[PDB]
Amino acid sequence: IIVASYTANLAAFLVLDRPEERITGINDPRLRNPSDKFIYATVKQSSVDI
Amino acid sequence: GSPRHTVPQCCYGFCIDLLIKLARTMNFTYEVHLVADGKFGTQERVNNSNKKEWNGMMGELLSGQADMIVAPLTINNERAQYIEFSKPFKYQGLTILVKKEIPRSTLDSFMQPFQSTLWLLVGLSVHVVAVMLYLLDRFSPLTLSSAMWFSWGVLLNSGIGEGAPRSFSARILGMVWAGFAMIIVASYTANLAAFLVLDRPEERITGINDPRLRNPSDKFIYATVKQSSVDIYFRRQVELSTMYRHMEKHNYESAAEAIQAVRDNKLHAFIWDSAVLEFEASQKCDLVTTGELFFRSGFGIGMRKDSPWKQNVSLSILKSHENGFMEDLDKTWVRYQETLTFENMAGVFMLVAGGIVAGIFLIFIEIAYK
Amino acid sequence: KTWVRYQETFENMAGVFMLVAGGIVAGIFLIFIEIAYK
Amino acid sequence: NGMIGEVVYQRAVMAVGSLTINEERSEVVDFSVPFVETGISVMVSRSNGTVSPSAFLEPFSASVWVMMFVMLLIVSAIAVFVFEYFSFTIGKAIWLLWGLVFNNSVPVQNPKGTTSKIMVSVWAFFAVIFLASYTANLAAFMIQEEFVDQVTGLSDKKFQRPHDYSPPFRFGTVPNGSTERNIRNNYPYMHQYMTRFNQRGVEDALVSLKTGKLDAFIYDAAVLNYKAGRDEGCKLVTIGSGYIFATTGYGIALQKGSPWKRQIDLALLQFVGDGEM
Amino acid sequence: VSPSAFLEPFSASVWVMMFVMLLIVSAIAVFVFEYFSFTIGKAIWLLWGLVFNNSVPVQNPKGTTSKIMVSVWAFFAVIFLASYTANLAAFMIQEEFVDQVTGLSDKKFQRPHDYSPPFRFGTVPNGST
Amino acid sequence: EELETLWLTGICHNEKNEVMSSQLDIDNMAGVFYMLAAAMALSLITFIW
Ligand SMILES: *[C@@H]1O[C@H](CO)[C@@H](O[C@@H]2O[C@H](CO)[C@@H](O)[C@H](O)[C@H]2NC(C)=O)[C@H](O)[C@H]1NC(C)=O
Ligand SMILES: *[C@@H]1O[C@H](CO)[C@@H](O[C@@H]2O[C@H](CO)[C@@H](O)[C@H](O)[C@H]2NC(C)=O)[C@H](O)[C@H]1NC(C)=O
Ligand SMILES: *[C@@H]1O[C@H](CO)[C@@H](O)[C@H](O)[C@H]1NC(C)=O
Ligand SMILES: *[C@@H]1O[C@H](CO)[C@@H](O)[C@H](O)[C@H]1NC(C)=O
Ligand SMILES: *[C@@H]1O[C@H](CO)[C@@H](O)[C@H](O)[C@H]1NC(C)=O
Ligand SMILES: *[C@@H]1O[C@H](CO)[C@@H](O)[C@H](O)[C@H]1NC(C)=O
C-alpha cells in the first residue's frame, strides 16, 4: 500500500505542468493595471500604437 | 383543477419565520392568506381598452386585497416604477438546473464491456507457448500439466510452489513470456487507471454563454415559469428574444412542475434563482446546477406607496442583518444540507463463481476418473 | 513549408542510474569490509 | 466624520463611491437600493495545506469484506478436501491466500491435485485486477484538490480564544471601521483581543499576511476577492463566499428628504436591468 | 488515436544502461558465487527474472551479498516499474491526434487504390471550390 | 471582434483529450509479437545447437 501510494504520488507529479506560469489573457486586469514586472511593449511608431 | 375549494391550512418555512421575526420586532397584528393564482405578476394585456394590467401578488396588492407582500420578490425596474421596494434580506442570482447525473463505467470495462481480444489473445498465446514448450521438452537437444502450471504462474505473478523444467534453451522462452506478461498487465493497469481518470465528458450547458441555446432546437428544452419576472427581464434585453421565443412555448405554472419534469427528463434545463436550486440539490441528489451566475438580485418585501411601515420595517430588516438572525435563518434552512465493486465487480464475481462451480465439477469428474 | 513550417524514458533515468551506481560501488567496498570481518 | 461628516452636516449631497451600510447611517441619512453583493470576509496567509489521502472506502466499504472471508473459507475447505484426498495449510489457507495477494510470502506446499492451484490462480487474478483498481483509485485521487480550511466562519471556536488551541494566532481589522462596530455589537471580547492586534495599511496588512506578520484579517468580501484575484503569486483564495458573514451590499447615501432617491433607484435598476452592470 | 511507443521510441539508449547495470550485478553475483550450485551462467536468467518478479522459482542464495544485491536490484526494479507506469500515464494524458490526410496535395487524393479502403469526398455543385 | 465572438460557437476546441481513447491499441501487441517472433527465432537457433 505504501509503494502504491508512492507510485501514485510520482505519477501525479508527472501528470500536470505548472498551468499559466505567465499570463496569456489580453483582458487580464493585471495587464490593465500593470506593475513594474510586467514589461510589455511595442515597436515605436507602429500600427499597434495607432 | 379546483375553482371553489379554499381551506385554512398551516403555513411555515423560511419567510414565515421572517414574518414572525418582524411581528416580534414591530408591534402589530396581521392576516396571512395565499394568492389566488400561482403567478408572481406581469404587465399583461387585458382583453379590452388596449391597456396592460397586473395579476398575482401585485394584482391582489394593488386591488387593495393585500397590504404587505413577504415573498421571494424578484426585484426589477418595472415594479419600482409603480410601487416601492424594501432593502433585500436575501441576495441571490440566476442559474440553470440540468441533469448531469449519469453513472459512468458500469462494469469498469474488465472483459465484457471491452471487446474480446485480450482473453482469447492470452488463451491462444499460452496455447502456442505450451505447444512449443512441449516440442522443446519431448525432444530435448508430470510434463504436460507441470508446464501448463508454470506457464500460468509466470503469466499470473503471484508466487506458487512450482518448478521450472529442464530449460537449457527454454529459459529464454520463459524470460520472454515473463516480460510479455508484465508489460501486458502494466499497460492494462496504466490505461485503465488513466481512462477512469479522464472519464469526464461535457454534457452540461455552462450558463448563459451557450450558442447551443442561442440557436436552440428540440434537444435542449429550456423553459420558465408562466408569467415570471425573469421572463420580463429577458423580454427587456435586446438580443434575448430567441430564448424568449423558446421558453414561451413551454411555460409552466409552478417550479415543482419543472422539477418533476427535469426529474422525469421531460425538460433539459430551467432558468431559476440560484440558492433555491442549491437547496433542492441538497434535497434531490440527482440535481447539479451550472456555474455561471448572472443577474445578482435581491429578495426583500413587496411594499405599497408612502406608508408608515416603510422606515422602521427597513430598520428591522437591517437589524436582522447586523445580528446573527441571518445565521439563524441559515441554520434552519440555508446552511442546512441533507471502482465501487457493487455495480462494477458484481459480474466479475459472478463469472468467478461460475468458474468455481465449473472447476469443482471438473475436479470431481477427475477424481471419478482417477 | 520552407521556413514557417520548418521548426528547430529520458527524464526518469539519469540521477537514478548515477545514484544507484554510486550506491552499488560503495556497497561493494562495504562487502569487502564485511568479508574481511568474517 | 468623512463622507458621513459631509452629508449629515449638509456640506455634500451624496456618496456615489463605495460605502458600508449599518443601522446608524440608516438613521442619520437614507441609503439607495444596493447593486452588488458585498458582505465581509477573512483573508489568511493560507500556506500549502494537505490533500488528506488518509482513508479509502470505495472498493470494499466494510461490506465486501464478508465475501472475502466467505471465499477464504471456501478455498480453505476445498484445500482440506484435497488434503483428505491426498501440507499444513488447513488454518494457514487464509494466510497463504491473502499473503499471495501481495506476492511476497514464503511459498507453502501447494498440492498437485489441480484444484487449489486453479482456485488460487483465479483469486490471484482477481487480486491483480483489484490492485489495478486500487492504483486506479489512487490515481483518480489526483483529480480533486482540497486543502482544508482552518476557520469555517465568524462563529469559530478558534475565534473564541487562540489560547484554547495549541498554536496561538492573530486577527485584524481596519481602524475606525464599521466592521469594528459590527464586532462591538456582536462580540466585545473579539474587540478586546483585536485591540492589541491592530494594523495601519490595507496593503501593509496584505504584505503582513504574505510575509507572515499577520495570521488573519477581516475586511469586506468582494474587495478581498478582487485583490486575491489580481494577486501576484496567486496564493490567496477566500474561505467561503459570504456564508457565515454579514451579507450586506453597497448603497448610495442620500439626505433625508432628497427628491433624487426615486430617480437614482430607477437608474440603478435600469443599469442592472440590461446586464450593463 | 491510441499510438504504440514503448521501447524503441522512448528507451532508445536507457535500455543500454539497464543492460550495463544488469551485467554489473551479474558479474557481482558470479564473483560471490565463485568466492564461497549452478548459478554461473544461470545467474543472468535469475537476474532478469527477478527484474520483473513474475513468480519464477529459481533458488535461494546462501551468500548474504547475493541477497543484498537482489534487495538493492529489486528496489531499483520497483522504482523503475513505478516510473514506467508514470510514463504510460503521461503517454495517455499527453495524447496526440494525428490525421489520415495531412494535406490538400495528398497522394491519397490522386487515386484511392493507393490504400486498401477506397475513400470518398465531394463538394457542392456549381461552386467556386 | 464582438460580432465574430457572438455569431461563432466555440465549445469544441482544438484536439480535446476526452474519453475517445477506447482502451484498445492494435500496434502495441503487434510489436510485442514481432519481438516474440524474434524470440522464437532465437529459440530455434538455440534448439538446433
Ligand atoms: C382538491 O380538488 C377537488 C376540489 O375541486 C377535491 O375533490 C372533490 O371535488 C368535488 C368537485 O369536483 C367536490 O364536490 C368534492 O367535495 C371534492 N372532494 C372532497 C373529499 O372534498 C379534492 O378533495 C381536493 N383535494 C386535493 C386532492 O388536493
Ligand atoms: C448546377 O447548375 C446546372 C444548370 O442549372 C444544373 O443542371 C440542371 O439540372 C437539372 C436536374 O436537376 C436538369 O434537368 C437540367 O437540364 C440541368 N440544366 C438546366 C438547363 O437547368 C445543376 O442541377 C446544378 N447543380 C446544383 C444542384 O448545384
Ligand atoms: C403592543 O400592542 C398591543 C395590542 O395593541 C398592546 O396591548 C401593547 O400595549 C403594545 N405594547 C407596546 C410596547 O406598545
Ligand atoms: C383574453 O386575453 C387572453 C390573452 O391575454 C386570451 O388568452 C383570452 O382568450 C382572452 N379572452 C378572455 C378571457 O376574455
Ligand atoms: C418608528 O420609529 C420611531 C422611533 O422614534 C417611533 O417614534 C415611531 O412611532 C415608529 N413608527 C413609525 C412612524 O413607523
Ligand atoms: C481612529 O480615530 C481616532 C480618533 O482620535 C484617531 O486618533 C486615530 O488615528 C484613527 N485611526 C485610524 C488611522 O483610523
DSSP D79-102: HHHHHHH----SSSHHHHHHHTTT
Q: Report which residue type is found at B14.
A: F
Residues E86, A10: C-beta atoms closer than 8 Å: yes
Chains F and A touch (3+ CB pairs under 8 A): no
E 53-72 residues inside an 8 A Cβ radius of D: 53, 55, 57
Query: Left, alpha or beta for B157 (phi > 0: left; psi -120 to 50: alpha)?
Result: left
Instruction: Give the Cβ contact number of residue D187 at 10 Å.
Output: 16
Question: What is the nearest CA distance from A50 to chain D, expressed in angstroms?
Answer: 28
- Experimental approach: cryo-EM
Cβ–Cβ contacts within 10 Å for residue B310, how many? 16
Q: Are E26 and E34 in contact (CB under 8 A)?
A: no
Ligand 6 binding pocket mutation candidate from D174, D176, D200 (most atoms within 8 A of CB)? D176
Element (H, E) at E120: none
Cα–Cα distance measured from residue B305 to residue D31, given in angstroms and rounded to the nearest whole number: 18
Phi, psi values for residue B233, rounded to 5°: -65, -35
User: Residue B90 pairs with which residues in a beta bridge?
Assistant: B299
Measure the CA angle with vertex B70, ends B65 and B74; round to 5°.
Answer: 105
Q: How far is the CA of E127 from the centre of ligand 2 (A)?
A: 13
Residues 6+ apart with CB under 8 A from B167: B173, B174
Establish whether residue B52 lines the binding site of ligand 4, counting it when its CB lies within 6 angstroms of any ligand atom: no
The residue of chain B nearest to residue D143, with distances taken between CA atoms, is B197
CA B1 to ligand 1: nearest atom: 5
Residues in chain A: 50
For residue B109, what are the CA distances in angstroms to B184, B197, E54? 16, 14, 25
Beta bridge partners of B92: B297
Q: Are the C-beta atoms of residues D249 and D21 closer than 8 Å to each other? A: yes
Return the number of other C-beta atoms located less than 10 Å from residue B25's C-beta.
16
SS3 annotation, chain B: CCCCCCCCCCCCCHHHHHHHHHHHHCCCCCCCCCCCCCCCCCCEECCCCCCEECCHHHHHHCCCCCCCEECCCCCCCCCCCCCCCCCCCEEEEEEEEECCCCCCCCCCCCCCCCCCHHHHHHHHHHHHHHHHHHHHHHCCCCCHHHHHHHHHHHHHCCCCCCCCCCCCCHHHHHHHHHHHHHHHHHHHHHHHHHHHHCCCCCCCCCCCCCHHHHCCCCCCCEECECCCHHHHHHHHCCCCHHHHHHHCCCCECCHHHHHHHHHCCCCCEEEEEHHHHHHHHHHCCCCEECCCCEEEEEECEECCCCCCCCHHHHHHHHHHHHCCHHHHHHHHHHCCCCCCCCCCCHHHHHHHHHHHHHHHHHHHHHHHHC
For residue E102, the surrounding DSSP H or E stretch is none
**Nearest residue to E80 (alpha-carbon basis) of C20, B210, F34:** C20
**Other CB atoms within 10 A of residue D32 CB:** 21
Query: Which of A3, A14, A15 has its CB closest to that of E78?
Result: A3
Strand, coil or helix: D35: coil
B132 and F49 in contact by Cβ < 8 A?
Answer: no
Residues in chain F: 49
Amino acid present at D137: N
Question: What's the rounded Cα separation, in Å, for the pair E43 and E65?
Answer: 14
Assign residue E29 a region (left: φ > 0; alpha: ψ between -120 and 50; beta: otherwise): alpha
Decide if E54 and B157 are in contact by the 8 Å CB cutoff.
yes
Residue B37 is labelled as binding a ligand: no
Distance (Å) from the alpha carbon of B128 to chain E's nearest alpha carbon: 19
Q: Are B196 and B281 in contact (CB under 8 A)?
A: no
Say if the Cβ atoms of F17 and B115 lie within 8 Å. Answer: no
Ligand lying closest to the C-alpha of residue E125: 2
Q: Do D103 and E57 touch (CB under 8 A)?
A: no
What stretch of H or E contains E110? none
Separation CA B2–CA B242 (nearest Å): 35
The whole-angstrom separation of Cα B194 and Cα B185 is: 14
Q: CB of A31 within 8 A of CB of A23?
A: yes
Q: Report d(CA D177, CA D164) in Å as an integer.
A: 27
The rounded distance, in Å, linking the Cα atoms of B191 and E90 is: 10
Dist CA B351 CA E56 (whole Å): 28
Cβ–Cβ under 8 Å, residues A4 and D134:
yes
**CB interface of D with E, residues 236-255, below 8 Å:** none
Report which of E92, D232, D194, E51 is spatially closest to residue B176, judged by C-alpha positions.
E51
Which of B109, B172, B242 to mutate to test binding with chain F, by most F CBs within 10 Å of its CB? B172
Exposed (0-12), middle (13-18) or buried (19+): which is E122, by Cβ within 10 Å? exposed
What is the rounded CA–CA span in Å between residue E10 and residue B294?
A: 49
Element (H, E) at E1: none
B303 closest CA partner among B295, B292, B312: B312
SS3 D30: strand
Q: Which helix H or strand E contains D183, and what residues bound it? A: helix D178-184
> What 3-state class would DSSP assign to D220?
strand
Contacting residues for D31 by C-beta, under 8 A, at least 6 apart? B87, D21, D25, D251, D252, D253, D254
Which residues, judged by CB distance below 6 Å to any ligand atom, belong to the binding site of ligand 6? Answer: D 175-176
Query: What b/e sequence results for E56-92 when a residue is b if at least 16 CB atoms lie within 10 Å of its CB, and e otherwise?
Result: bebeebeeebbebbbeebeebbebbbbbbbbbbbbbb
Distance between Cα D227 and ligand 6 center (Å): 25
Query: Exposure string (b/e) for D121-144, b if CB count within 10 Å is 16 or more?
Result: bbbbbbbbbbbbbbbbbbbbbbee
Residue D171's DSSP bridge partners are D216
Chain E residues with CB-CB distance to D135 below 8 A: 85
Return d(Cα B3, Cα B140) in angstroms, integer.
99
Which residues on chain E are in Cβ contact (under 8 Å) with B159? 55
**Interface contact flag, E57 D139, Cβ < 8 Å:** no
Binding-site residue set of D: 18, 20, 25, 178-179, 220
User: What residue type is B338 in one-letter code?
Assistant: E
Q: Which residues pair with B53 in a beta bridge?
A: B44
Instruction: Say if residue B225 is exposed, middle or buried (CB neighbours under 10 Å; 0-12, 13-18, 19+).
Output: buried
Q: Of all atoms in ligand 1, which is nearest to the CA of residue B5? A: 4
- The residue type of B127 is H
In sequence order, the 6+-apart residues with CB closer than 8 A to the CB of F27 are E3, E4
Confirm if B281 and B287 have CB atoms less than 8 A apart: yes
CB nearest D138 (choices: A4, A29, A33): A4
Q: Give Cα B346 to chain centroid, integer Å.
A: 25
Closest ligand by atom to D180 CA? 6
Q: Closest Cα to residue E32, out of E11, E20, E17, E47?
A: E47
Q: How far apart are CA B173 and CA E49, in angstroms?
A: 12
| Residue D221 CA to ligand 6 centre (angstroms) | 23
CA separation for the pair D135, D138 (Å, rounded): 5
CA D76 to chain centre: 48
Smallest CA-to-CA distance from B356 within D141, D115, A26 is with D115
DSSP three-state, residue E105: coil
Chain F: give the shortest CA distance to residue E108, in Å: 22
What type of residue sits at position D253? Answer: A
Contact D36, D222 (CB under 8 A): yes
The grid cell for B148 is 501448463
CB atoms inside a 10 Å sphere around CB E5: 14
Is-contact B6 B35, C-beta < 8 A?
Answer: no
Confirm if B157 and E49 have CB atoms less than 8 A apart.
no
Give the chain E residue nearest F29 (alpha carbons): E4
Q: Residue B51 CA: which ligand is closest?
A: 4
**What are the DSSP calls for C1-38, one per residue?**
--SSS-----TTSHHHHHHHHHHHHHHHHHHHHHHHH-
